[PDB]
Amino acid sequence: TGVLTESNKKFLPFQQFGRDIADTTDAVRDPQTLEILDITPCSFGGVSVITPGTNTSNQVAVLYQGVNCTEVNVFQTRAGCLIGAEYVNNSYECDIPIGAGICASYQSIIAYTMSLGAENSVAYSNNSIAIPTNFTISVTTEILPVSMTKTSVDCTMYICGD
Amino acid sequence: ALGKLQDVVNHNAQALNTLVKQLSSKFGAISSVLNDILSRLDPPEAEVQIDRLITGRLQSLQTYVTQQLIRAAEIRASANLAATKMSECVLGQSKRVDFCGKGYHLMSFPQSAPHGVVFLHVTYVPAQEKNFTTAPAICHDGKAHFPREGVFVSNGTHWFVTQRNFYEPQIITTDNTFVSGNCDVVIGIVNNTVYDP
Amino acid sequence: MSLGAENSVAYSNNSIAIPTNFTISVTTEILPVSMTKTSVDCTMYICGDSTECSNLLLQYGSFCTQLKRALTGIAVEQDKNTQEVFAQVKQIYKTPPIKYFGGFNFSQILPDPSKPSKRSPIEDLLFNKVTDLICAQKFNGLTVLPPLLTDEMIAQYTSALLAGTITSGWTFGAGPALQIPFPMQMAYRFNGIGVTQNVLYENQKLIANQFNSAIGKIQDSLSSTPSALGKLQDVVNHNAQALNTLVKQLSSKFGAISSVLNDILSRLDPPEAEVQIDRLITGRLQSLQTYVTQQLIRAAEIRASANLAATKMSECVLGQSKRVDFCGKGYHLMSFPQSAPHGVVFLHVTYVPAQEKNFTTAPAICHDGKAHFPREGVFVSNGTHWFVTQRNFYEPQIITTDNTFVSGNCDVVIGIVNNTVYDPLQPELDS
Ligand SMILES: *[C@@H]1O[C@H](CO)[C@@H](O[C@@H]2O[C@H](CO)[C@@H](O)[C@H](O)[C@H]2NC(C)=O)[C@H](O)[C@H]1NC(C)=O
Ligand SMILES: *[C@@H]1O[C@H](CO)[C@@H](O[C@@H]2O[C@H](CO)[C@@H](O)[C@H](O)[C@H]2NC(C)=O)[C@H](O)[C@H]1NC(C)=O
Ligand SMILES: *[C@@H]1O[C@H](CO)[C@@H](O[C@@H]2O[C@H](CO)[C@@H](O)[C@H](O)[C@H]2NC(C)=O)[C@H](O)[C@H]1NC(C)=O
Ligand SMILES: *[C@@H]1O[C@H](CO)[C@@H](O[C@@H]2O[C@H](CO)[C@@H](O)[C@H](O)[C@H]2NC(C)=O)[C@H](O)[C@H]1NC(C)=O
Ligand SMILES: *[C@@H]1O[C@H](CO)[C@@H](O[C@@H]2O[C@H](CO)[C@@H](O)[C@H](O)[C@H]2NC(C)=O)[C@H](O)[C@H]1NC(C)=O
Ligand SMILES: *[C@@H]1O[C@H](CO)[C@@H](O[C@@H]2O[C@H](CO)[C@@H](O)[C@H](O)[C@H]2NC(C)=O)[C@H](O)[C@H]1NC(C)=O
Ligand SMILES: *[C@@H]1O[C@H](CO)[C@@H](O[C@@H]2O[C@H](CO)[C@@H](O)[C@H](O)[C@H]2NC(C)=O)[C@H](O)[C@H]1NC(C)=O
Ligand SMILES: *[C@@H]1O[C@H](CO)[C@@H](O[C@@H]2O[C@H](CO)[C@@H](O)[C@H](O)[C@H]2NC(C)=O)[C@H](O)[C@H]1NC(C)=O
Ligand SMILES: *[C@@H]1O[C@H](CO)[C@@H](O[C@@H]2O[C@H](CO)[C@@H](O)[C@H](O)[C@H]2NC(C)=O)[C@H](O)[C@H]1NC(C)=O
Ligand SMILES: *[C@@H]1O[C@H](CO)[C@@H](O)[C@H](O)[C@H]1NC(C)=O
Ligand SMILES: *[C@@H]1O[C@H](CO)[C@@H](O)[C@H](O)[C@H]1NC(C)=O
Ligand SMILES: *[C@@H]1O[C@H](CO)[C@@H](O)[C@H](O)[C@H]1NC(C)=O
């Protein structure tokens, strides 16, 4: 199953079919008329559903991965076509990752380019220094997994039972 | 907050559930129940059906063991990191940056958690910074004076020497400065008096 | 093979070697951070458009769900690895408009305004030097997923880290960014490795020239060597190779009459077609499981490398590290992060001692029946006179009460030599 586009490839007279580097057909010669056609498979995409928690809302957005918007609140991203989210020029922290610098959040569902950080310009000069005059004692949490559940499998009973 | 430990627990349960789920798979055989296969067929074809079930179940079990081994390696690496943190953050003060909390590390406290450890990192964070005019050295009597442990700061009219991480201005003296060379070599040296005790 | 050039160290009980000069050495460390994110449609890959094949595939159970879940875990893991290595500052720092840092030149590592990508010349070189197969891989139901952080944003994070380190030293890592002049920052780093501030200040122009020359050499070395960026390219190669192998596996009969499902359906009745499709499904499923297993092992290796890269970014770039060989060869001074495709390159600026000279050494000096020990240095003799100098640079100073401390009598100490110890107070009271 494929689209048959015009081909610029010059086949030798014996050759009938054409193959990719990976041994998949990319070209063919028509039997009725001796012309070369570029066989290209029909478009496919990975449908991804972007949703907030169900209790908060039931609105969803659909991302078609790798599919241009013209071949399927519609916005075009490098990741694919995003339908059901409205692009906002504002930048916020990432809530739901879409990819290619695009993130989604619920406020309706909006898509935006995520802000890396707040912008700070340090006042560097040849002869000025900044000295702390006070301190904060900060306690922070680090959570590390140490062990897993210990599992034993009876191979004979699992495969065969009694 | 405790997502990582729960995730590990979730994976183990999920893996077992998947393995249990695999028992309900025909694997290309007439039935997924061995007892039905024995009850319904003669041994020459029952052997073939049992073989199909055995190969599918064995493949499932091998897949489960392979994922378990990869997860075991990941957990072992995490445990080794946790042991390193326990030795270096709890049993000692660490000069490594960001190893034992954000900021300058002071001490750490271990807390047990299911399948895990939680480290409470007590760190010192500088705050309320103030601008000062600074110089590399002080020129007094044709000699260059450098801070032994601090930095030279000026509030606009007077020069003092203070510790780098806290503002504590002190009079510039021979006690807290050392003399190396003449003033001319140093770039940016400023002229100020150096007190003698 | 020869292990090494042969050197015999001239050990003697009373001789020490003291460096009289230094070399500022910049070295490159290349670390992989992330891999290509791959997603596989299990049904499309194994069966394509065949309904009968999908129906037979359903009998095997949740294998497809397991493979998709594992790939999804790897895909999120790569983004997490990139966040851990690069997103370590919540403030995007910027360099001052006047790029004067006491004679230190950072043009090669700072972002270039002229370039549209806003990357440094070193970063641009790194991107250039790391590079219908893709179409076929896409056509077989395998999809490459874009990285969550784009290359420009990763470059922006590296720029923020560079701006923070250059303008603020190590303060920004541990808290608010506190401005410090770059020569004073370099002097602090010199103090960290045990060399006094005066050595940096007196030789500031020489140190700046050495650093600039080293940075230029680093750019030339990366540009002129094919195998400098081998590790990142290898990772890219493995991912492409794995996909190619998986695509190649579709052309395998796997013990069946044909490798084409459509031919099997067209030529055979369903009782034997089911057997042939089963053979194809089991072979393709085994191939897919094998691919996922290698991907998981590689993901673990890349995760370990990313954890190491994050540790280097925290300890070498955001701080000065006393760990030996962790942040370059030599005594570590500072480090600079540069973005690279699927990777980070660390420019480690280190202090290497050079032009060492022999001196006669003693553990202690005996004066007035008392043993004097150096507070911070070592006792050296040039043949006739005794001086005390810092261990890592030769700076002879007169032995005085100020730089020595008295513990015990001379007799207990072994190897003690007799020399005068000057008193600062003696001229003052005398005059
Ligand atoms: C130290 O002084 C500098 C300049 O004298 C201060 O930097 C200014 O900060 C304000 C407030 O954020 C900005 O609006 C200016 O644009 C900054 N100037 C420059 C040249 O960057 C800095 O805030 C002072 N530091 C402290 C702790 O007061
Ligand atoms: C340093 O910061 C501490 C807080 O971190 C300041 O303590 C506060 O002082 C104000 C006014 O004196 C009180 O209203 C607060 O209740 C205090 N907070 C705490 C936690 O004690 C302290 O005054 C600051 N010191 C300087 C010199 O600025
Ligand atoms: C810089 O700090 C010094 C020391 O604190 C200041 O000198 C003192 O200033 C106070 C108030 O102006 C006077 O009462 C003292 O008599 C001063 N001491 C001496 C020894 O003169 C100085 O004023 C500060 N400069 C600025 C611009 O704030
Ligand atoms: C720091 O002090 C030195 C010596 O007191 C100053 O050097 C003198 O400068 C004046 C005016 O430029 C000359 O007339 C003298 O001949 C200089 N003497 C010597 C020994 O060089 C120097 O100018 C001072 N620097 C500052 C910034 O005030
Ligand atoms: C310090 O002195 C020792 C010995 O006085 C020197 O070691 C000699 O080095 C030369 C040249 O490499 C060799 O031919 C000798 O055999 C070495 N002698 C011994 C006893 O090992 C050493 O080179 C001197 N250090 C410096 C920096 O010149
Ligand atoms: C320390 O080494 C530096 C070079 O690493 C020396 O600087 C060189 O000095 C010579 C003669 O003065 C010049 O011809 C070179 O061009 C200098 N090189 C550089 C890179 O500036 C310096 O002289 C040495 N110092 C000592 C005390 O040995
Ligand atoms: C910093 O280094 C850069 C390059 O490392 C210097 O730029 C060079 O400037 C010279 C003189 O104008 C040109 O001939 C070169 O073509 C420049 N190189 C590049 C790569 O553009 C720069 O002058 C140095 N100094 C400062 C203050 O930026
Ligand atoms: C060891 O170092 C001392 C001090 O640098 C040298 O003593 C000086 O030597 C020079 C040249 O011989 C004389 O002009 C000075 O007057 C000496 N100073 C004193 C205080 O005597 C000494 O010569 C060096 N010894 C050797 C063997 O090089
Ligand atoms: C170091 O100095 C001490 C004290 O001046 C020396 O001890 C003296 O040695 C002489 C000759 O052996 C004796 O006549 C004195 O009676 C000793 N005095 C004491 C208090 O013991 C010692 O010999 C010197 N050591 C060296 C290696 O020169
Ligand atoms: C077949 O028919 C087409 C259409 O009439 C003609 O153009 C062509 O020359 C014929 N012969 C071959 C060998 O294709
Ligand atoms: C000091 O800094 C300013 C801007 O930061 C610069 O214009 C000036 O040239 C610097 N001074 C010297 C002596 O380089
Ligand atoms: C000093 O070293 C030499 C050989 O290096 C050795 O023979 C001698 O015994 C040593 N001196 C003492 C007092 O042990």
Coordinates of N, CA and C in Angstrom, one line a residue, chain B residues 4 11 14-15 18-19 21-22 24-29 52 56 59-60 63-64 66-67 70-71 73-74 77 95-99 102-104 124-132 134-137 146-148 150-152 164-165 178-182 185-187, chain C residues 56 58-63 66-67 69-70 77 80 88 100 170-179 181 184 187-188 191 196-198 201-205 274 278 282 285-286 289 292-293 296-297 300 303 311 313-315 318-321 323 326 376 395 397 402:
Chain B
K4 N 9.7 8.4 43.7 CA 10.7 7.5 43.3 C 10.6 6.1 43.9
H11 N 6.8 -0.8 39.9 CA 7.3 -1.6 38.8 C 7.4 -3.1 39.1
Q14 N 3.9 -4.4 39.0 CA 3.5 -4.4 37.6 C 4.1 -5.6 36.9
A15 N 5.4 -5.8 37.1 CA 6.1 -6.9 36.5 C 5.5 -8.2 36.8
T18 N 2.2 -8.6 35.1 CA 2.3 -8.9 33.7 C 2.7 -10.4 33.5
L19 N 3.5 -10.9 34.4 CA 3.9 -12.3 34.4 C 2.7 -13.2 34.6
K21 N -0.3 -12.3 34.1 CA -1.2 -12.1 33.0 C -0.8 -13.0 31.9
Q22 N 0.5 -13.3 31.7 CA 1.0 -14.1 30.6 C 0.4 -15.6 30.7
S24 N -2.6 -16.3 30.9 CA -3.9 -16.4 30.2 C -3.7 -16.3 28.7
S25 N -2.5 -16.5 28.2 CA -2.2 -16.4 26.8 C -2.1 -17.8 26.2
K26 N -2.9 -18.0 25.1 CA -2.9 -19.2 24.4 C -1.5 -19.6 23.8
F27 N -0.8 -18.6 23.3 CA 0.5 -18.7 22.6 C 0.5 -19.6 21.4
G28 N -0.6 -19.4 20.6 CA -0.8 -20.2 19.4 C -1.3 -21.6 19.6
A29 N -1.8 -21.9 20.8 CA -2.4 -23.2 21.1 C -3.9 -23.1 21.2
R52 N 3.8 -25.6 22.9 CA 3.5 -24.2 22.5 C 3.3 -23.4 23.8
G56 N 6.0 -20.4 25.1 CA 5.5 -19.0 25.4 C 5.7 -18.6 26.8
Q59 N 9.4 -18.0 27.5 CA 9.9 -16.8 27.0 C 9.4 -15.6 27.9
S60 N 8.2 -15.7 28.4 CA 7.7 -14.7 29.3 C 8.5 -14.6 30.6
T63 N 11.9 -13.1 29.9 CA 11.8 -11.7 29.7 C 11.7 -11.0 31.1
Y64 N 10.9 -11.6 32.0 CA 10.7 -11.0 33.3 C 12.0 -11.0 34.1
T66 N 15.1 -11.0 32.8 CA 16.0 -10.0 32.2 C 15.7 -8.6 32.7
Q67 N 14.4 -8.2 32.7 CA 14.0 -6.9 33.2 C 14.4 -6.8 34.7
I70 N 18.1 -6.0 35.0 CA 18.4 -4.7 34.6 C 18.0 -3.7 35.8
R71 N 16.8 -3.9 36.3 CA 16.4 -3.1 37.4 C 17.2 -3.3 38.7
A73 N 20.4 -4.0 38.6 CA 21.6 -3.2 38.4 C 21.4 -1.8 38.7
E74 N 20.2 -1.2 38.3 CA 19.9 0.2 38.5 C 19.8 0.5 40.0
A77 N 23.2 0.4 41.7 CA 23.9 1.7 41.5 C 23.3 2.8 42.4
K95 N 33.0 18.6 51.0 CA 33.3 19.8 50.2 C 32.9 19.7 48.8
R96 N 32.4 18.6 48.3 CA 31.8 18.4 47.0 C 30.6 19.2 46.8
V97 N 30.5 19.9 45.7 CA 29.4 20.8 45.4 C 28.2 20.1 44.9
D98 N 27.1 20.2 45.6 CA 25.7 19.7 45.2 C 25.6 18.2 45.5
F99 N 26.7 17.6 46.1 CA 26.6 16.2 46.5 C 25.7 16.0 47.7
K102 N 21.9 21.6 48.1 CA 22.2 22.8 47.5 C 22.8 23.8 48.5
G103 N 23.9 24.4 48.1 CA 24.5 25.3 49.0 C 25.7 24.7 49.7
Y104 N 26.4 25.4 50.6 CA 27.6 24.9 51.2 C 27.1 23.9 52.3
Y124 N 24.4 25.7 54.3 CA 24.5 27.2 54.6 C 24.3 27.9 53.3
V125 N 23.4 28.8 53.2 CA 23.1 29.6 52.0 C 23.4 31.0 52.3
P126 N 24.3 31.7 51.6 CA 24.5 33.1 51.8 C 23.3 33.9 51.4
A127 N 23.1 35.0 52.1 CA 21.9 35.9 51.8 C 22.3 37.4 52.2
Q128 N 21.5 38.3 51.7 CA 21.6 39.7 51.9 C 22.9 40.3 51.5
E129 N 23.4 39.9 50.3 CA 24.7 40.4 49.8 C 24.7 41.9 49.6
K130 N 25.8 42.5 49.8 CA 26.0 43.9 49.6 C 27.2 44.2 48.8
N131 N 27.1 45.2 47.9 CA 28.2 45.6 47.0 C 29.3 46.4 47.8
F132 N 30.6 46.1 47.4 CA 31.7 46.8 48.0 C 32.7 47.0 46.9
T134 N 36.4 46.6 45.6 CA 37.5 45.7 46.0 C 38.8 46.0 45.2
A135 N 39.9 45.6 45.9 CA 41.2 45.7 45.3 C 42.0 44.4 45.5
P136 N 42.9 44.0 44.6 CA 43.7 42.9 44.8 C 44.7 43.0 46.0
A137 N 45.3 44.2 46.1 CA 46.3 44.4 47.2 C 46.3 45.8 47.7
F146 N 48.8 41.6 50.9 CA 47.7 40.7 50.4 C 47.0 40.1 51.6
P147 N 45.7 39.8 51.5 CA 45.0 39.2 52.6 C 45.4 37.8 52.9
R148 N 45.6 37.4 54.2 CA 46.0 36.1 54.5 C 44.8 35.1 54.2
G150 N 41.2 36.6 53.8 CA 40.0 37.3 53.4 C 40.1 38.1 52.1
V151 N 39.4 39.1 51.9 CA 39.3 40.0 50.8 C 39.3 41.4 51.2
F152 N 39.9 42.3 50.5 CA 39.8 43.8 50.8 C 38.5 44.3 50.2
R164 N 35.5 36.0 53.2 CA 34.8 35.9 51.9 C 33.3 35.6 52.0
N165 N 33.0 34.7 52.9 CA 31.6 34.2 52.9 C 30.7 34.9 53.9
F178 N 49.9 39.7 54.4 CA 51.3 39.3 54.2 C 51.9 40.2 53.0
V179 N 53.2 40.4 53.1 CA 53.9 41.3 52.2 C 54.7 40.4 51.2
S180 N 54.4 40.6 49.9 CA 55.2 40.0 48.8 C 55.4 41.0 47.7
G181 N 56.7 41.5 47.6 CA 57.0 42.4 46.5 C 56.6 43.8 46.7
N182 N 57.0 44.6 45.7 CA 56.6 46.0 45.6 C 55.2 46.2 45.0
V185 N 54.3 45.9 40.5 CA 54.0 44.7 39.7 C 52.5 44.4 39.7
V186 N 51.8 44.5 40.9 CA 50.4 44.1 41.0 C 49.5 45.1 40.2
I187 N 48.6 44.5 39.4 CA 47.7 45.3 38.6 C 46.5 45.6 39.4
Chain C
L56 N -3.5 -13.3 15.3 CA -2.6 -14.3 15.8 C -1.7 -13.7 16.9
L58 N -2.3 -11.3 19.0 CA -3.1 -11.1 20.2 C -3.0 -12.3 21.2
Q59 N -2.8 -13.5 20.6 CA -2.7 -14.7 21.4 C -1.4 -14.6 22.4
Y60 N -0.4 -13.9 21.9 CA 0.8 -13.8 22.8 C 0.7 -12.9 24.0
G61 N -0.3 -12.1 24.0 CA -0.5 -11.4 25.3 C 0.1 -10.0 25.3
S62 N 0.6 -9.6 26.4 CA 1.0 -8.2 26.7 C 2.5 -8.0 26.4
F63 N 3.1 -8.7 25.5 CA 4.5 -8.5 25.1 C 4.6 -7.1 24.5
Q66 N 4.6 -4.4 27.1 CA 5.9 -4.4 27.8 C 7.0 -3.7 27.0
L67 N 7.0 -3.9 25.7 CA 8.1 -3.3 24.8 C 7.8 -1.8 24.7
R69 N 6.2 0.1 26.9 CA 6.4 0.7 28.2 C 7.9 0.9 28.5
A70 N 8.7 -0.1 28.1 CA 10.2 -0.1 28.3 C 10.8 1.1 27.4
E77 N 13.7 8.8 30.3 CA 15.0 8.8 31.0 C 16.0 9.7 30.3
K80 N 15.3 13.2 31.2 CA 15.7 13.4 32.6 C 17.2 13.6 32.7
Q88 N 20.8 22.9 35.9 CA 21.3 23.0 37.2 C 21.2 24.4 37.8
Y100 N 35.8 42.3 29.2 CA 37.2 42.4 29.7 C 37.2 41.7 31.0
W170 N 32.3 30.4 42.1 CA 31.5 29.3 42.6 C 30.4 29.7 43.4
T171 N 30.2 31.0 43.6 CA 29.1 31.5 44.5 C 27.7 31.2 43.9
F172 N 27.5 31.3 42.6 CA 26.2 31.1 42.0 C 25.7 29.6 42.2
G173 N 26.7 28.7 42.2 CA 26.3 27.3 42.4 C 25.7 27.1 43.8
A174 N 26.3 27.7 44.8 CA 26.0 27.5 46.2 C 24.9 28.5 46.7
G175 N 24.4 29.3 45.9 CA 23.5 30.4 46.4 C 23.3 31.5 45.4
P176 N 23.0 32.7 45.9 CA 22.9 33.8 45.0 C 24.2 34.1 44.3
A177 N 24.1 34.6 43.1 CA 25.4 34.9 42.3 C 26.0 36.2 42.9
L178 N 27.2 36.1 43.4 CA 27.9 37.2 43.9 C 29.0 37.6 43.0
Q179 N 29.0 38.8 42.5 CA 30.0 39.2 41.5 C 31.4 39.3 42.2
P181 N 35.6 40.1 40.7 CA 36.5 40.3 39.6 C 37.2 39.0 39.2
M184 N 40.6 38.2 40.9 CA 40.4 37.8 42.3 C 39.8 36.4 42.4
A187 N 42.6 34.1 41.8 CA 43.5 34.1 43.0 C 42.9 33.2 44.1
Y188 N 41.5 33.2 44.2 CA 40.9 32.3 45.1 C 41.1 30.9 44.7
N191 N 44.5 29.9 45.7 CA 44.5 29.5 47.1 C 44.0 28.1 47.4
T196 N 49.8 30.8 46.9 CA 49.4 32.1 47.4 C 48.9 33.1 46.3
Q197 N 48.1 34.1 46.8 CA 47.5 35.0 45.9 C 48.5 35.9 45.1
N198 N 49.6 36.2 45.7 CA 50.7 37.0 45.1 C 51.2 36.4 43.8
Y201 N 48.7 37.3 41.2 CA 48.7 38.7 40.8 C 49.9 39.2 40.1
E202 N 51.1 38.7 40.6 CA 52.3 39.2 39.9 C 52.5 38.7 38.5
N203 N 52.0 37.4 38.3 CA 52.1 36.8 37.0 C 50.8 36.7 36.2
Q204 N 50.0 37.7 36.4 CA 48.6 37.7 35.8 C 48.6 37.8 34.3
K205 N 49.5 38.6 33.7 CA 49.6 38.7 32.2 C 50.1 37.3 31.6
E274 N -1.5 -19.8 9.1 CA -1.4 -19.5 10.5 C 0.0 -19.9 11.1
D278 N 2.8 -17.5 12.3 CA 3.3 -17.7 13.7 C 4.8 -17.7 13.7
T282 N 7.0 -15.0 15.8 CA 7.9 -15.4 16.8 C 9.3 -14.8 16.5
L285 N 9.1 -11.0 16.9 CA 9.0 -10.6 18.3 C 10.3 -10.9 19.1
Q286 N 11.0 -11.9 18.7 CA 12.3 -12.2 19.3 C 13.3 -11.1 19.0
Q289 N 12.3 -8.0 21.0 CA 12.7 -8.1 22.4 C 14.2 -7.9 22.5
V292 N 15.0 -4.2 22.3 CA 14.6 -3.5 23.5 C 15.6 -3.9 24.6
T293 N 16.0 -5.1 24.7 CA 17.0 -5.5 25.7 C 18.3 -4.8 25.6
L296 N 17.8 -1.1 26.6 CA 17.7 -1.0 28.0 C 19.2 -1.0 28.6
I297 N 20.0 -1.9 28.1 CA 21.4 -2.0 28.6 C 22.1 -0.7 28.3
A300 N 21.0 2.1 30.5 CA 21.7 2.1 31.8 C 23.1 2.7 31.7
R303 N 22.8 6.4 31.2 CA 22.3 7.0 32.5 C 23.5 7.1 33.5
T311 N 27.6 15.0 37.9 CA 28.5 15.1 39.0 C 29.7 16.0 38.6
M313 N 29.6 18.4 36.3 CA 29.1 19.7 36.2 C 28.9 20.4 37.5
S314 N 28.4 19.7 38.5 CA 28.3 20.2 39.9 C 29.7 20.5 40.5
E315 N 30.6 19.5 40.4 CA 31.9 19.6 41.1 C 33.0 20.3 40.4
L318 N 30.8 24.2 38.8 CA 30.1 25.0 39.8 C 30.9 25.2 41.1
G319 N 32.1 24.5 41.2 CA 32.9 24.5 42.3 C 34.3 24.2 41.9
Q320 N 35.3 24.3 42.8 CA 36.7 23.9 42.6 C 36.8 22.6 43.3
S321 N 37.3 21.6 42.6 CA 37.4 20.2 43.2 C 38.8 19.8 43.6
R323 N 39.5 16.7 44.2 CA 39.6 15.3 43.8 C 40.6 15.2 42.7
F326 N 39.6 13.9 38.7 CA 38.2 14.1 38.4 C 37.9 15.2 37.4
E376 N 53.2 26.8 57.0 CA 52.5 26.4 55.8 C 53.5 25.9 54.7
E395 N 59.2 30.2 46.3 CA 59.3 31.6 46.7 C 60.0 31.6 48.0
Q397 N 61.7 32.6 51.4 CA 61.5 33.7 52.4 C 62.4 33.4 53.6
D402 N 57.4 34.4 62.6 CA 56.1 34.6 62.0 C 55.6 33.4 61.2

